[PDB]
Amino acid sequence: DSKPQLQRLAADADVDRMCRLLEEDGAFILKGLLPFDVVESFNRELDVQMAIPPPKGERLLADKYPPHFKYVPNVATTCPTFRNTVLINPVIHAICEAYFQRTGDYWLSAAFLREIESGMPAQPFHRDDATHPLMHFQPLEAPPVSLSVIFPLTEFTEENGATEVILGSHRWTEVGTPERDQAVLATMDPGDVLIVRQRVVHAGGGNRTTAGKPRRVVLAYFNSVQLTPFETYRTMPREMVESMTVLGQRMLGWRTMKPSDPNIVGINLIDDKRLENVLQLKAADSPAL
Amino acid sequence: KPQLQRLAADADVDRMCRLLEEDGAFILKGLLPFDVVESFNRELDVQMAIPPPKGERLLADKYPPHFKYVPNVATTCPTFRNTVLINPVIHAICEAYFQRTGDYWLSAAFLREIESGMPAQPFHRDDATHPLMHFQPLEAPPVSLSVIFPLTEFTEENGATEVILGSHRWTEVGTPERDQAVLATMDPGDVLIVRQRVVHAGGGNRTTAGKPRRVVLAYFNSVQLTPFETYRTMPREMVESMTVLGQRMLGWRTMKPSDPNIVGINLIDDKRLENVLQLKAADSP
Ligand SMILES: O=C(O)CCC(=O)C(=O)O
Ligand SMILES: O=C(O)CCC(=O)C(=O)O
Ligand SMILES: [Fe+2]
Ligand SMILES: [Fe+2]
Closest CA to A217 of A149, A126, A115: A115
Note whether A235 contacts B101, CB cutoff 8 Å.
no
CB atoms within 10 A of CB B104: 26
Tell me whether B74 touches chain A (CB under 8 Å).
no
Q: Report the b/e string of B258-268 with b at 16+ CB within 10 A.
A: beebebbbbbb
Interface test with chain A among B106, B252, B269, B279, by most A beta carbons within 10 Å: B269
Q: What is the residue type of A211? A: A
For ligand 1, atom 5, the nearest C-alpha belongs to: A204
Q: What is the DSSP string of B22-45?
A: HTSEEEEES-S-HHHHHHHHHHHH
**If you compute the radius of gyration of chain B from its CA atoms, what whole number of angstroms results?**
19
Note whether A235 contacts B62, CB cutoff 8 Å.
no
Indicate the helix (H) or strand (E) that contains B93: helix B88-97
Closest CA to B119 of B177, B204, B202, B176: B204
For ligand 2, atom 3, the nearest C-alpha belongs to: B202
The neighbouring-strand residues paired with B91 are: none
- Taking chain B, what is the end-to-end CA distance rounded to the nearest angstrom? 53
Note whether B102 contacts A131, CB cutoff 8 Å.
no
DSSP state for residue B268 in the 8-state scheme? E
Q: What is the residue type of A157? A: T
Evaluate whether B271 touches A60 at the Cβ level (below 8 Å).
yes
Given the CA of residue A163, which atom of ligand 1 is nearest to it?
A: 3
Residues with Cβ within 8 Å of A191's Cβ and at least 6 positions away in sequence, in order, are: A32, A33, A34, A35, A36, A38, A39
Residues with Cβ within 8 Å of B261's Cβ and at least 6 positions away in sequence, in order, are: A130, A131, A132, A133, B102
Closest CA to B3 of B186, B256, B227: B186
Q: How far is A247 from chain B (nearest CA, A)?
A: 19
CB atoms within 10 A of CB B15: 11
Q: Name every chain A residue with its beta carbon within 8 A of the beta carbon of B104.
A: none
Angle at A175 (CA atoms; ends A169, A178), nearest 5 degrees = 85
In chain B, which ranges are E strands? 6-8, 25-29, 68-70, 104-114, 144-150, 162-163, 182-183, 191-195, 200-201, 213-222, 267-268, 271-272
CATH number of B1-285: 2.60.120.620
Closest CA to A216 of A59, A45, A12: A45
**If you compute the radius of gyration of chain A from its CA atoms, what whole number of angstroms results?**
19
Residues with Cβ within 8 Å of A59's Cβ and at least 6 positions away in sequence, in order, are: B270, B271
Q: How far is A252 from chain B (nearest CA, A)?
A: 12
Given phi > 0 = left and psi -120 to 50 = alpha, else beta, which region is B41? alpha
Closest CA to A195 of A22, A45, A13: A22
* Residue B6 burial by Cβ neighbours in a 10 Å radius (0-12, 13-18, 19+): middle
Q: What is the DSSP string of B193-211?
A: EEETT--EE------SSSP
Given phi > 0 = left and psi -120 to 50 = alpha, else beta, which region is A271? left
What are the residue boundaries of the structural domains of chain B, listed by start?
1-285
Q: Name every chain B residue with its beta carbon within 8 A of the beta carbon of A228.
A: 223-227, 265-266
Collapse the DSSP code of B183 into the 3-class scheme (helix H, G, I; strand E, B; otherwise coil) and give the result: strand
Evaluate whether A89 touches A15 at the Cβ level (below 8 Å).
no
Angle at A45 (CA atoms; ends A44, A47), nearest 5 degrees = 60
List, by residue number, the catalytic residues of B: 63
Evaluate whether B208 touches B45 at the Cβ level (below 8 Å).
no
Tell me whether A278 touches chain B (CB under 8 Å).
yes
- Taking chain A, what is the end-to-end CA distance rounded to the nearest angstrom? 48
A1-289 folds as Jelly Rolls (2.60.120)
Distance CA A43, CA A49 (A): 10
Distance CA B223, CA B238 (A): 22
Evaluate whether A76 touches A108 at the Cβ level (below 8 Å).
yes
Residues ending a continuous segment of chain A before a break (C–N > 2.5 Å): none
Evaluate whether A278 touches A271 at the Cβ level (below 8 Å).
yes
Distance CA B240, CA B221 (A): 23
Closest CA to A216 of A226, A207, A225: A207
Q: Which of A64, A77, A274 sits opposite B263 (nearest CB)?
A: A64
Evaluate whether A134 touches B224 at the Cβ level (below 8 Å).
yes
Closest CA to B203 of B258, B150, B146, B162: B162
Interface test with chain B among A135, A265, A280, by most B beta carbons within 10 Å: A265
Residues with Cβ within 8 Å of A63's Cβ and at least 6 positions away in sequence, in order, are: none
Evaluate whether B181 touches B13 at the Cβ level (below 8 Å).
no
Q: Is the CB of A123 under 6 A from ligand 1?
A: yes
Residues B232, B234, B238, B242: is their CA dihedral positive or negative? Answer: negative
Enter the resolution in angstroms.
1.9
Distance CA B53, CA B50 (A): 8
Indicate the helix (H) or strand (E) that contains A114: strand A106-116
User: Ligand 1 pocket test: which of A109, A148, A150, A197 has the largest number of ligand atoms within 8 Å of its C-beta?
Assistant: A150
Q: What is the residue type of B157? A: E
Distance CA A92, CA A34 (A): 11
CB atoms within 10 A of CB B207: 18
Given the CA of residue B114, which atom of ligand 2 is nearest to it?
A: 1
Distance CA A194, CA A209 (A): 22
Evaluate whether B145 touches B94 at the Cβ level (below 8 Å).
yes
Q: What is the DSSP string of B129-146?
A: SSGGGGGS-TTSPP-EEE
Indicate the helix (H) or strand (E) that contains B244: helix B244-249
Collapse the DSSP code of B110 into the 3-class scheme (helix H, G, I; strand E, B; otherwise coil) and give the result: strand
Distance CA A190, CA A36 (A): 8
Distance CA A263, CA A142 (A): 16
Evaluate whether A228 touches B223 at the Cβ level (below 8 Å).
yes
Q: Report the b/e string of A161-187 with b at 16+ CB within 10 A.
A: bbbbbbbebbebeeeeeeeeeebbbbb
Q: What is the DSSP string of A93-113?
A: HHHHHHHTTTTB-EEEEEEEE
A-B interface: how many C-beta pairs under 8 angstroms?
175
